[PDB]
């Protein structure tokens, strides 16, 4: 009779849990129970190309109705201590593609249960999850990635449990507040579908983001140092061919410098082994400095016999190398845009 | 009647827990319960730019009143074993921006419960928490950071629970004893406010520090080696231009040395990819050594035809390079102070 | 009488667990209980040569019959909450070669129990396991690996429990969907056998894959840089022998470049210490550049006394080195194919 | 009556735990309970300068008297299974400066409870703890460190619990058996005191060690390579000044070699950023090789105009550089001893 | 009467656990209980010189008799579910030198309990343990190590529990199947003894292995590259002394190459700081290349004044350096064999 009477509320709640069976879903043997889900994305911790995964922190909320929990006489929504969730049936929701997830537990287990007079249950969890994201890094670092989060029921088919995004397209919030230092989020989508398996159709909810990488860092730290070394290799062309020590030292040191750039960048670059766009550019620049030293090899071999022809080779090399390298840049960036 | 009678105290405490409901907050259905909080900061373990987080160890204390726990006849404050906290209602306090936190449990769970005759509860926890701190590292290593710790109730709105800093501005202690090897704490602030959400206003407490990085290490290990290499590149100007091997070797080795400095520092520097102030300085010095070798390319090309003009270019380069580099230093440090 | 009557189903299930003993296997003291197993491979997280292990995520399902759990009157398959599995006997199945495995527990423990009227139990678990895989890396990176997963009963012999692959060769699914960036799966096999131990025969199930490594990355990043340095060393042969500084600098810098390639690749290469095929090729190329500099040592020592003989040595070196290196390549790749 | 009668001992122990309250300390409301502590140090796992902590494994024993546990008729000390400790009051002892600690649990929880007829309790735990140790590394690697372990009661003041070292100065054993590869233990001290806090005085026990680092490794691997490069730079002085290519190459390569030593040592050196003694020596040697190349710059500029003065500068440089470097060594080692 | 009657077996087992006290050892107050132990070594995961520990996976079995568990009428050995071990007394066996150990728990806790009619208990556990192994690495990488596993009772003295190796020298199996990529096992020993402590003698079992490292990897990757650089330094002796640029560049580049070998190997070598045999060889080779460049310093200083004496120094250096280096190799390998 009195909502503020704590003794009466204890009697009301104990009546709900008297005879309550946690092993049975609501409306057992009848129509499936519809569970609505909405996510408040706290942050995206990291996106790892080496491990092919990303880490996500979110507020995961589930919304279903259990008529066994309906109470009367109290015109209020009962927010209960999170330890009562162990005494109730909850959906066996799991993330299909997650690798390691947990529920925060400081200072208490980050969980909330809110009851409603008609039997509706609001069930919230603060979850940090690492989900697998297979990344196509052929265009690295100019790549665009699409990482998803799959939500499914572990043991119940669509004859028992159905999923939907509560609130429509606005079910997932906090996407605009995500601050990824390396990526920029382009779009996010919410997909609801049933997936047919051996044991029957299973409810499925999908949340996906499209990530576009920021290339500003790689231009300054990776492409620019390699270009300048390639430019520096062409200095040998304008050096007089009689100076054997100067042009050989200049040619071989640029090759030495190029290898140091290549070898040390591999430590900073992702450890995943296969061909990438950045590797094609770095190897392309190494070929040019390799051919620049070979150019002087031909000139130095024929400088004594045919000075006019040796000088002619050197003069043309002052144009072919800048033109071919610029032509190589044109085709490379057009193919990677 | 006798405070020292252990049997009587057991009877008194068991009476308090007889009929006690942990699922209901104090004054359920009535005015919100006010929870006072104070923090004793044990230490700040680390501040990570790569992970964008910091680790904090603290004594977290909560102070509320529960009239269900009021006892009479014992004019003493009852300090109970920490296992009794599981038999009482405690606030569902959590840290909004934490990534991984735990309560120490050696040799026992680091927790204390103290009861008072009027029903007041003192609840302490020793917590190590890793909290996310988004760092703006454009001015790295001359950056100044502001890392916070957000405290909020997980399931209760301001109609049920209210937060305040117990003791005012002196609620948080131990800040002056924090010893960060890399940072110096400038100020800390305590903020109390209510944040409006979809489900209503939520109590919020904020503790923030301002961190100023120490630049002494970077001057000796990063800026000084790069400056001296740039100074060493200008030695080629005073070397006679006829010595083709000497000036070419000197010019190309400084470029080789500069790349080794750049590549190896990236391992020591933070792994976060984007433009930083230190990167601008390192790349700026590489341009100067790159142009120093290009300067001899022009001189060596025209030394035979116009010795006077080639010598004139060399003479002016002994002034422009020191002046431009000093001018570059002036604008760089003024823009980063 | 009514399948949709939740109260009747609770009575039926409680009758099954009344007097049920979890310490005794089904048909205790009689014929062994046959447990059928099928695996749905979610993914293969990683394959580590340094740790000699691979990480696997899968849906592990076990299928046995317990006549103590037979129920009548309900013509339906009872899917129960996963917390009921603690109240039933389950096989003590473990993975023989695993190093670290766990069952996912977000948002609930990833586990399902399904009962059938005849007493059959379907028991599913989502398990991430790290299994030891001893790899023969003599042919690295042209190696082919065979990693297995051994399934055995911990405490029961074949007189008590028997294993079989439920569904035959189609028991394990999802192998075709595995996407390993570095490896390609060639075949998988299912083996069932009994292994005789000291305490008797034990049931055993084996799932093995054959992995073939992708060599495309190593050709571009490891073999190609080393070959080009070896080619660049032969440039000294066509350089005139009077230029002492040029040929010595060219010869010694290629050795310097080769060491930098060798030393830095070790960081990228697996940390396991022993002889590998890639090490033989890298050391072979170092011998050629080492002998190239020794070739000029002989020429420079006898150029003054016998110019004709010194020139003859240089002329033959322009053929022997390309021929021997090509001959070395022919034998190397034939032995490693 | 019969000590060997297992049934009688069960009756005696069950009588002690009948009515026993774990929430109340012994002599509740009366004099404080004195807890004696002794530690058997198993090992010191590691000492980390990067993390500013050390790892310790020890046998932690606590010794107090509880008259509620007094028994008569059995003239024996009852060693009970470690699961009985959960049914008894134990001190809330914790380590003030620990970062991560645990109690070993294989094959059982490493814990022992021994009862005595007068009510005395012996309570042992095998604990591995990581304790914070703030290290002053200005004199690194010639530093001497003092790492402590603070022991305190979490919730009880000196009015309730008092601490003392059981056995006096011999309370802590196993210090002489500690084998640190990098450090040598000089002394250890045991301190007992009461620390006044806001809520009153708290018992405190302190165990501290003084660690002296071993410098033999750094002499061979760090100081010796840098000294020899500095010695090698002076070779240019005895080289004839007409050889422009030789002295420039020798001077610039020593600078290149010095940077490689500096950059690569940072990976092996601790990652903590600030000035250290080793950094001063490495930077000092770089200045000498930097000035050695500048010395030839002056000589090469004036060799044509004033050969006598240019030769005079070279002759004096053969003495000033060895003398200044030796003078630099004298002041450096005297200031760091 | 009927072994196959599951109801009768439940009655028999429940009778054993009726009145059973887990806090008391078998034959409490009487003769000590003898516990037999045998180990089936599954594998040795890794041996870490940096952490001074090794990881071991094994089947740990304990064999004792408890007359309280004797049953009659069932002529069979009762294999029970592993959850019954929590209802029985088990020895408090722990590993003295372990650092981190756990019992596998997928799909169940890897544990078995087998009862016998006379009261004998067979108790098995699958344990992965990391045990501390102090390694003497003065002879690294030609070192031979002896790693042990100490087994002891935590709380019981020899008056209560006694240990023995069940099966004699054949108690530990699977040693011959251990496959360490870096080490080869020479011998293993089983030791049983009582260790006298302050509180009395304690039972102790010791299992130790002798490990011999494989040096094949270090010969190819560490010793061979350093030897060839030292050989390459002697090329300067046969180069004509008039070529100042050639011999200086050759001498200083070998020093540069040697430092790169030394610095980069430290990353691959163990991080433990102190003198090792490999460090002596690497530093010895650096002295030879250091003295080789100093040899030309003397020759170049006196070539103009005394060409005959300068040539004489060069001629003798072609013999002393190969002889001293070979003499250095002879003493080094004899002292390290
Ligand atoms: C990252 O990558 C993933 C995987 O490719 C992308 O996920 C896909 O997203 C698209 C939408 O952008 C999904 O397409 C939609 O699927 C809905 C569900 O499909 C189920 O139901 C339909 C029948 O309704 C069945 O045919 C189907 O088999 C499933 O059972 C559909 O309802 C949608 O249909 C709507 O649009 C079509 C036109 O496209 C209309 O004709 C319809 O009337 C209706 O309006 C639609 O087809 C697709 O299913 C998702 N794939 C998966 C595997 O889930 C992410 O979008 C991507 N991320 C980003 C940022 O791009
Ligand atoms: C990775 O490496 C592992 C280990 O080498 C390979 O595993 C082996 O796989 C082969 C099959 O490819 C297995 O061979 C088969 O074993 C079955 C079980 O053996 C038990 O039972 C037989 C009697 O039936 C006993 O003799 C034996 O001792 C065992 O107790 C056999 O039933 C199979 O026999 C079938 O084929 C033979 C011909 O080969 C016929 O004569 C038979 O009639 C019958 O049709 C067969 O012998 C082998 O046992 C596996 N080894 C282990 C240790 O399990 C993986 O295959 C490999 N991975 C890849 C991808 O290659
Ligand atoms: C690593 O660094 C720590 C911190 O600096 C060192 O710890 C200190 O150790 C010294 C001893 O070496 C301690 O000094 C002793 O403290 C005792 C306790 O102090 C309490 O009680 C006294 C009154 O008795 C109060 O004044 C005080 O405020 C405390 O409440 C004292 O009892 C000792 O006094 C004894 O010596 C003095 C002379 O020194 C005599 O006059 C006295 O009569 C008596 O005999 C003494 O003062 C010091 O307290 C420790 N500091 C801390 C913070 O605990 C470690 O020693 C160091 N490690 C190594 C290896 O050097
Ligand atoms: C790695 O390093 C460890 C530590 O050094 C080695 O462990 C030692 O192994 C040897 C055997 O190889 C052990 O020696 C034996 O110890 C037994 C137990 O000693 C207890 O009991 C005896 C009395 O019986 C007491 O004197 C002693 O103090 C102990 O209380 C002895 O019973 C053995 O005696 C047998 O041999 C001797 C001759 O050597 C005969 O005279 C006896 O009659 C009898 O037959 C023997 O002394 C030694 O105890 C171990 N040390 C430790 C600390 O446990 C490992 O062997 C090594 N690993 C490898 C692979 O080498
Ligand atoms: C029990 O705790 C209360 C609260 O800490 C103590 O009350 C304080 O008493 C001091 C004086 O001793 C006052 O200065 C404070 O203002 C009081 N605080 C409050 C909230 O009342 C009380 O003294 C303690 N009881 C005992 C026996 O120590
Ligand atoms: C509060 O509810 C309890 C339980 O129904 C009841 O006994 C009590 O009388 C109520 N309070 C009042 C003031 O009536
Ligand atoms: C202590 O309290 C108990 C419980 O109220 C009571 O039975 C006992 O008599 C008290 N002690 C004394 C000495 O009265
Ligand atoms: C449902 O089953 C319960 C338990 O057997 C029974 O008491 C109840 O009457 C059943 N429902 C109906 C509508 O009969
Ligand atoms: C052992 O103690 C029990 C409990 O006190 C008692 O019933 C039994 O008789 C004792 N044993 C003997 C031989 O008296
Ligand atoms: C099996 O044992 C139970 C318990 O002792 C007994 O009641 C039952 O009669 C036995 N079975 C048969 C067939 O006698
Ligand atoms: Cl957490
Ligand atoms: Cl802890
Ligand atoms: Cl998980
Ligand atoms: Cl452990
Ligand atoms: Cl495990």
Q: How far apart are CA B16 and CA A332, in angstroms?
A: 78
* DSSP-assigned letters across all residues of A99-111: EEEEE--SBS-SE
The answer to whether residue E316 sits within a structural domain is yes
- A268 close to B266: Cβ distance less than 8 angstroms: yes
Instruction: Show the tokens assigned to C47.
Output: 């394959």
State the count of interchain CB pairs (< 8 A) between B and D. Answer: 170
- A123 close to A62: Cβ distance less than 8 angstroms: yes
Q: Ligand 5 centre and the CA of D153: distance in Å?
A: 21
- A86 close to C115: Cβ distance less than 8 angstroms: no
Instruction: Show the tokens assigned to E309.
Output: 């004496």
Q: How far apart are CA C253 and CA E254, in angstroms?
A: 9
Q: How far apart are CA C137 and CA C276, in angstroms?
A: 6
Q: Do residues E209 and E236 share a domain? A: no
Which of E50, E230, E234, E235 is the best substitution to test chain C (most C C-beta atoms within 10 A)? E235
B94 annotated as a binding-site residue: yes
The answer to whether residue C290 sits within a structural domain is yes
Residues C129, C132, C137, C143, Cα dihedral to 10°: -50
Residue E163 phi/psi, 5-degree rounding, is -110, 150
* DSSP-assigned letters across all residues of B213-274: E--HHHIIIIIHHHHHHHHHHTHHHHS-TT-HHHHHHHHHHHHHHHHHHHHHHHHHS----S
**Distances in whole angstroms, Cα of residue C209 to Cα of each of B299, C94, C149, E269, E307:** 66, 19, 9, 34, 73
The answer to whether residue D321 sits within a structural domain is yes
Q: Do residues B266 and B187 share a domain? A: no
Q: What is the separation, in whole angstroms, between the first and last Cα of chain E?
A: 70
CB atoms E255 and D260 under 8 Å: no
**Distances in whole angstroms, Cα of residue C320 to Cα of each of C236, C237, C316, C317, C324:** 14, 11, 6, 5, 6
Would you mind telling me the total number of residues written for chain A in this entry? 337
CA angle B328, B331, B333 (to 5 degrees): 100
Tell me, what DSSP letter sits at residue E41? Answer: E
3-state SS record for C33-75: EEEEEEEEEEEEEEEECCCCEEEEEEEEEEEEECHHHCCCCCC
Chain C residue at shortest CA distance from A137: C181
Cβ neighbors of B333 (< 8 A, separation 6 or more) are: none
Residue E46 phi/psi, 5-degree rounding, is -160, 160
Q: Are strands A33-48 and A161-165 parallel, antiparallel or unpaired?
A: parallel
Would you mind telling me the total number of residues written for chain B in this entry? 337
Residue with tokens 């950059």: D263
Q: How far apart are CA A161 and CA C108, in angstroms?
A: 16
Indicate the SS3 state at residue D81: coil
* Nearest-CA residue for atom 2 of ligand 10: E8
Q: How far apart are CA B47 and CA B55, in angstroms?
A: 7
Would you mind telling me the total number of residues written for chain D in this entry? 337
Tell me, what DSSP letter sits at residue E8? Answer: H
Indicate which CATH number applies to the domain containing D280.
1.20.58.390
Q: How far apart are CA E257 and CA C290, in angstroms?
A: 13
Closest partner residue to B293 among A84, A218, A232, by Cβ? A232
Q: Do residues B89 and B220 share a domain? A: no
To the nearest whole angstrom, how far is the Cα of E160 from the nearest Cα of chain D?
A: 9
Instruction: Show the tokens assigned to A108.
Output: 């208490």
Q: Which residues of A touch C129 (CB under 8 A)?
A: none
Residue finishing a domain among A213, A240, A262: A213
Cβ neighbors of E131 (< 8 A, separation 6 or more) are: E53, E54, E56, E95, E97, E98, E99, E147, E148, E149
Residue A110 phi/psi, 5-degree rounding, is -75, 85
* DSSP-assigned letters across all residues of A114-149: EE-TTSEEEEEEEEEEEEE-----TTTTS-EEEEEE
Tell me which residue of D157, D158, D135 sits closest to D146, measured CA to CA.
D135
The answer to whether residue C1 sits within a structural domain is no
Residue with tokens 């233990």: D185
Residue C164 phi/psi, 5-degree rounding, is -155, 155
CB atoms C283 and E239 under 8 Å: no
Residue D125, H or E segment: strand D120-132
Report whether the peptide linkage leading into residue A141 is cis, meaning its omega lies within 30 degrees of zero.
yes
A152 annotated as a binding-site residue: yes
Q: How far apart are CA C337 and CA E122, in angstroms?
A: 52
Give the ligand at the shortest distance from the Cα of D169: 3
Left if phi > 0, otherwise alpha if psi is -120 to 50, otherwise beta: which for C76? beta
Chain C residue at shortest CA distance from A242: C243
Helices (H) and strands (E) in chain B, counts: 7, 12
Report whether the peptide linkage leading into residue D141 is cis, meaning its omega lies within 30 degrees of zero.
yes
Q: Do residues D103 and D81 share a domain? A: yes
**Distances in whole angstroms, Cα of residue C204 to Cα of each of C37, C154, E61:** 11, 10, 21
Closest partner residue to A125 among C107, C229, C245, by Cβ? C107
Q: Do residues A179 and A298 share a domain? A: no
Q: Are strands E144-153 and E93-95 parallel, antiparallel or unpaired?
A: antiparallel
CA atoms within 13 A on the CB side of D274: 15
Instruction: Show the tokens assigned to B158.
Output: 């301001």
CA atoms within 13 A on the CB side of D242: 7
Tell me which residue of B262, B264, B257 sits closest to B280, measured CA to CA.
B262
Residue finishing a domain among D163, D196, D213: D213
E197 annotated as a binding-site residue: yes
- D151 close to D163: Cβ distance less than 8 angstroms: yes
**Distances in whole angstroms, Cα of residue C220 to Cα of each of A324, C23, E317:** 21, 60, 43
Instruction: Show the tokens assigned to D11.
Output: 């009756």
Q: Do residues D188 and D66 share a domain? A: yes
Q: Do residues A165 and A242 share a domain? A: no
Instruction: Show the tokens assigned to E267.
Output: 């990353």
Chain A residue at shortest CA distance from C262: A263
Tell me which residue of D245, D228, D256 sits closest to D296, measured CA to CA.
D245
Resolution given for this structure, in angstroms: 2.7
Residue D268, H or E segment: helix D244-268
Instruction: Show the tokens assigned to B177.
Output: 């004893």
- E276 close to E140: Cβ distance less than 8 angstroms: yes
Q: How far apart are CA C315 and CA C320, in angstroms?
A: 9
Q: How far apart are CA B113 and CA B102, in angstroms?
A: 18
To the nearest whole angstrom, how far is the Cα of D29 from the nearest Cα of chain B?
A: 4
Q: Residue A114, Cβ neighbours under 10 Å: how many?
A: 17
The answer to whether residue D1 sits within a structural domain is no
Q: How far apart are CA B294 and CA B181, in angstroms?
A: 43
C93 annotated as a binding-site residue: yes
Tell me which residue of B46, B146, B134 sits closest to B97, measured CA to CA.
B134
Q: Which of D6, D8, D72 to mutate to test the pocket of ligand 9 (most atoms within 8 A of CB)?
A: D8
Residue D310 phi/psi, 5-degree rounding, is -65, -40
Sign of CA dihedral E324, E327, E331, E336: positive
Binding partners of A (≥3 Cβ pairs within 8 A): B, C
CA angle B298, B301, B306 (to 5 degrees): 95
Residues near ligand 1 (Cβ within 6 A) = A 146, 148, 187, 189, 191, 193-194, 206, 208-210
CB atoms A106 and B94 under 8 Å: yes
Instruction: Show the tokens assigned to C154.
Output: 């911990």
- D297 close to D317: Cβ distance less than 8 angstroms: no
Q: How far apart are CA A308 and CA A302, in angstroms?
A: 9
**Distances in whole angstroms, Cα of residue B200 to Cα of each of B156, B158, D142:** 9, 8, 60
State the count of interchain CB pairs (< 8 A) between A and B. Answer: 170
Q: How far apart are CA B92 and CA B82, in angstroms?
A: 17
The answer to whether residue A150 sits within a structural domain is yes
Tell me which residue of C56, C37, C47 sits closest to C152, measured CA to CA.
C37
Residue A56, H or E segment: strand A53-65
Q: How far apart are CA A313 and CA A307, in angstroms?
A: 10
- A95 close to A129: Cβ distance less than 8 angstroms: yes
Compute chain C's Rg from CA coordinates.
Answer: 32
* DSSP-assigned letters across all residues of D42-62: EEEEEEETTTTEEEEEEEEEE
Instruction: Show the tokens assigned to E108.
Output: 């169940």
Q: How far apart are CA C140 and CA C213, in angstroms?
A: 9
Ligand 2 atom nearest residue C186's Cα: 60
Indicate the SS3 state at residue E96: coil
Instruction: Show the tokens assigned to E279.
Output: 């460090």
Residue finishing a domain among D196, D213, D230: D213
Tell me, what DSSP letter sits at residue A164? Answer: E
Q: How far apart are CA B308 and CA B310, in angstroms?
A: 6
- A128 close to A102: Cβ distance less than 8 angstroms: yes
Residue C10, H or E segment: helix C6-17
**Distances in whole angstroms, Cα of residue A205 to Cα of each of A163, A192, B21, C107, D255:** 7, 5, 38, 15, 61
**Distances in whole angstroms, Cα of residue A133 to Cα of each of A47, A136, C45:** 9, 10, 11
Closest partner residue to C6 among A28, A98, A248, by Cβ? A28
Instruction: Show the tokens assigned to A272.
Output: 């995943």
- D212 close to D187: Cβ distance less than 8 angstroms: no
Q: How far apart are CA B269 and CA B279, in angstroms?
A: 10
Tell me which residue of D313, D136, D184, D173 sits closest to D241, measured CA to CA.
D313
Tell me which residue of B110, B108, B93, B107 sits closest to B57, measured CA to CA.
B110
Q: Do residues D51 and D167 share a domain? A: yes
**Distances in whole angstroms, Cα of residue B274 to Cα of each of B136, C110, D104:** 11, 40, 44
- E249 close to D239: Cβ distance less than 8 angstroms: no
Chain A residue at shortest CA distance from C3: A29
Instruction: Show the tokens assigned to B168.
Output: 């005012």
Give the ligand at the shortest distance from the Cα of A15: 6
Compute chain D's Rg from CA coordinates.
Answer: 32
Would you mind telling me the total number of residues written for chain E in this entry? 337
- B118 close to A100: Cβ distance less than 8 angstroms: no
Range of the domain at B264: 216-335
Q: How far apart are CA D99 and CA A210, in angstroms?
A: 39
Q: Ligand 2 centre and the CA of C202: distance in Å?
A: 16
Number of compact structural domains in chain C: 2
Residues D38, E195, D123, D78, Cα dihedral to 10°: -140
Indicate the SS3 state at residue A79: strand
Q: How far apart are CA A112 and CA B155, in angstroms?
A: 5
Angle between helices C277-302 and C224-233 (to 10 degrees): 10
Q: Ligand 12 centre and the CA of B40: distance in Å?
A: 18
Indicate which CATH number applies to the domain containing D52.
2.70.170.10
Cβ neighbors of E178 (< 8 A, separation 6 or more) are: E41, E43, E44, E185
Would you mind telling me the total number of residues written for chain C in this entry? 337
Q: Residue B10, Cβ neighbours under 10 Å: how many?
A: 16
CB atoms D28 and B45 under 8 Å: no
Binding partners of B (≥3 Cβ pairs within 8 A): A, D
Left if phi > 0, otherwise alpha if psi is -120 to 50, otherwise beta: which for D319? alpha
Tell me, what DSSP letter sits at residue D151? Answer: E
To the nearest whole angstrom, how far is the Cα of B200 from the nearest Cα of chain D?
A: 37
Compute chain B's Rg from CA coordinates.
Answer: 32
Give the ligand at the shortest distance from the Cα of D74: 9
Q: Are strands E172-173 and E33-48 parallel, antiparallel or unpaired?
A: parallel
- D104 close to D126: Cβ distance less than 8 angstroms: yes
Q: Do residues E204 and E232 share a domain? A: no
Q: Do residues B179 and B324 share a domain? A: no
To the nearest whole angstrom, how far is the Cα of C11 from the nearest Cα of chain E?
A: 22
CA angle A67, A68, A70 (to 5 degrees): 65
Q: Which residues of D touch E67 (CB under 8 A)?
A: none
Residue with tokens 């020890």: D58
Write the residues followed by a gap in chain B (C–N more than 2.5 A): none
Left if phi > 0, otherwise alpha if psi is -120 to 50, otherwise beta: which for E168? left
**Distances in whole angstroms, Cα of residue B304 to Cα of each of A249, A303, B45:** 22, 19, 65
Q: Are strands C144-153 and C93-95 parallel, antiparallel or unpaired?
A: antiparallel
Residue D307, H or E segment: helix D307-335
Indicate the SS3 state at residue B43: strand
- D109 close to D103: Cβ distance less than 8 angstroms: yes
How far is C-alpha D160 from the geometric centre of its chain's CA atoms? 33
Helices (H) and strands (E) in chain D, counts: 7, 12
Q: Do residues A162 and A257 share a domain? A: no
Tell me which residue of A187, A192, A166, A191 sits closest to A176, measured CA to CA.
A187
Q: How far apart are CA C19 and CA C24, in angstroms?
A: 12
Closest partner residue to B107 among D89, D93, D271, by Cβ? D93
The answer to whether residue D30 sits within a structural domain is yes
The answer to whether residue A144 sits within a structural domain is yes
To the nearest whole angstrom, how far is the Cα of C129 from the nearest Cα of chain A?
A: 11
Q: How far apart are CA B33 and CA B36, in angstroms?
A: 10
Q: How far apart are CA B288 and CA B279, in angstroms?
A: 15
Burial of D114 (C-beta count, 10 Å sphere; 0-12/13-18/19+): middle
Report whether the peptide linkage leading into residue A67 is cis, meaning its omega lies within 30 degrees of zero.
no
Q: Ligand 5 centre and the CA of B42: distance in Å?
A: 25
Q: Do residues E186 and E58 share a domain? A: yes
Residue A103 phi/psi, 5-degree rounding, is -105, 130
**Distances in whole angstroms, Cα of residue A168 to Cα of each of A65, A95, A171, A250, D123:** 19, 20, 6, 65, 59
Q: What is the separation, in whole angstroms, between the first and last Cα of chain A?
A: 70
Q: How far apart are CA C29 and CA E13, in angstroms?
A: 14
Tell me which residue of A155, A173, A174, A153 sits closest to A164, measured CA to CA.
A153
């Amino acid at each position: 009779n009195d909502p503020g009477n704590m003794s009466f509320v204890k009697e009301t709640v104990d009546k709900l849990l008297k005879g309550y069976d946690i092993r049975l879903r609501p409306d057992f043997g009848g129509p499936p129970v519809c569970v609505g889900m909405n996510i408040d994305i706290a942050s995206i911790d990291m996106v790892s190309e080496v491990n092919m995964d990303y880490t996500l922190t979110m507020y995961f909320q589930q919304y279903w109705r259990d008529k066994r929990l309906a109470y009367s006489g109290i015109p209020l929504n009962l927010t209960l201590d999170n330890r009562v969730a162990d005494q109730l049936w909850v959906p066996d929701t799991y993330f299909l593609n997650d690798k390691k997830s947990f529920v925060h537990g400081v200072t208490v287990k980050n969980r909330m249960i809110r009851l409603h007079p008609d039997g509706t249950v609001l069930y919230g969890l603060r979850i940090t999850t690492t989900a697998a994201c297979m990344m196509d890094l052929r265009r690295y670092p100019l790549d665009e990635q699409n990482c998803t989060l799959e939500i499914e029921s572990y043991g119940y088919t669509t004859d028992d449990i159905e999923f939907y995004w509560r609130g429509g397209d606005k079910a997932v919030t906090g996407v605009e507040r995500i601050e990824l230092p390396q990526f920029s989020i382009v779009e996010h989508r919410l997909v609801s579908r049933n997936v047919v398996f051996a044991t029957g159709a299973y409810p499925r909810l999908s949340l996906s983001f499209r990530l576009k990488r920021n290339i500003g860092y790689f231009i300054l730290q990776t492409y620019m140092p390699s270009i300048l070394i390639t430019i520096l290799s062409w200095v040998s062309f304008w050096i007089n061919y009689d100076a054997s020590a100067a042009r050989v030292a200049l040619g071989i040191t640029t090759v030495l410098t190029m290898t140091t750039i290549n070898t040390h960048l591999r430590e900073t670059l992702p450890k995943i082994p296969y061909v990438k766009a950045i590797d094609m550019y770095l190897m392309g620049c190494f070929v040019f400095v390799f051919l620049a030293l070979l150019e002087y090899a031909f000139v130095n071999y024929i400088f004594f016999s045919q000075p006019a022809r040796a000088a002619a080779i050197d003069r043309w090399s002052r144009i072919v190398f800048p033109f071919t390298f610029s032509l190589f840049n044109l085709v490379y960036w057009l193919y990677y845009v």
